[model samples]
Target: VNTITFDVGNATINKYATFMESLRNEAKDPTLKCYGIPMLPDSNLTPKYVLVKLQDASSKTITLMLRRNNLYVMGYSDLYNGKCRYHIFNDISSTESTDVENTLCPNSNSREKKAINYNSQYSTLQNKAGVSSRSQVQLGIQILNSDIGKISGVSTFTDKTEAEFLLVAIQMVSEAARFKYIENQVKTNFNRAFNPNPKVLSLEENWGKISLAIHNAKNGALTSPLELKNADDTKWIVLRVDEIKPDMGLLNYVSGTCQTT
Candidate 1:
């Protein structure tokens, strides 16, 4: 499968890294509110770098760009609705993007905008047209050899949208893992409240790793899905992040499924 991953080291992301930083640092200034349409890949240096991982095969030109603000980071692609899908790293804004466009489309007028609109419309329709078949057997199946289990979701796409959904599925699994991390912390704090020795508990005390994951996801770092086991190690809830699949796709649109076993 064709794949693309972007980080701060890439020249493409370096350009706006500082601009995003400036906005965050100067957030108190009311003058810089919502400067422009936010797109994917905006970043700042505080987190050291940002990350974007994309996988697609058969064609190399598929790209996603979205217009939204307020989220620290997000990735969405639902073909059922005609939405321009994309991922974001920080508050998106700035004159820099316009400059990038100018350099790419130099001196173009409204015609280019119209063309972009038309192209986007046509692309979605074409994307829907490309399809492969999949199946599901939910009734009776019994085998527990491998740690892997069942997955329920679209794992394939003909266009960028499906690939996006796959990534979102993976992300949601990570989300679940993060929640579990915090839930355990809460449980520990609850149990410790009965300790014989008197001691004060700070909310932030056991949340270092939990908070780190939060920061990682928000700042464009990849968060891995995890498996949590009971204190005695007799039982476990495994969220496997390694093997989401279509593992392949057409034109820059990749697809993958998620499973929790």
Candidate 2:
């Protein structure tokens, strides 16, 4: 039996309800063990399993199964956004997993130029060195122990204050160098030419073309990693896909966030 579980919040009155309700309406399995009820306390409705942890471990285990087996799939729901938002996960380490990651797109043609056009180009790259350096320095001090007085056959000496200062100096220089490198790359990519935004009509067509391109690339595979190169030689790797219905006040299109190569 494919057992399901729950991880719910107490604050949102209908959060768990919405999830279960959606699941029951869409995917109803008789073997599924789940029941949700609400009680009236102080003249208001409150779910019974508020602040409760997941009951079945199968839901959690299957997630691990997907990771361990290198299996990939997309999820779509209307709870978070007005449209069906699809989220995908990268691979995770596992002992029981089969080596099927590389074989996902083995038959895809390399010679065919399946180019995908975009409507508008937006760069969302962020520099996280500043935040990382500060947090790492704080953590280094927090984890420093007083047992640094001896090694295997020699004496190792360093105080918390000295180590903290050394860490700061090392990270300060490293962050500065990283910033310089990132700045150069950003400027080079920003100066490169990109295609102009497509018109509303063309954008719809472009969306279809993108869907077809992804479909062709994946062919018959369960999931495939997509890497699209722009005219400027910059590469974008698709991370997740958000599928929405057009009748719901938006285009019936597949959208997702991308990470650079």
**Ten contiguous residues with the weakest lDDT in model 1:** 138-147
* TM-scores for candidates 1 onward, in order: 0.21, 0.14
* RMSD (Å) of each candidate, 1 decimal: 19.2, 24.7
Tens digit of lDDT per residue, candidate 1, span 132-196? Answer: 21111010001100001111112333334433232332221211122333223323442222211
Give me candidate 1's TM-score against the actual structure: 0.21
Q: For model 1, what is the alpha-carbon lDDT of residue 218?
A: 21
- Model 2 lDDT tens row, 1-261: 121233311212243334333323222211211011110112111111111112121121011111111011211011111211111122222321112122221233421111111111111000112222232333111121111111111122223333342232222111111122212222233323222211211222233343433333322221444454433446544433322111011111122321101
Q: List the residue pairs that clash in candidate 2.
A: none
Cα error, residue 215 of model 1, in Å, equals 10
lDDT of each: 0.23, 0.22
Q: What is the lDDT of residue 233 in candidate 1?
A: 38
Error of 2 at 26 (Å): 20
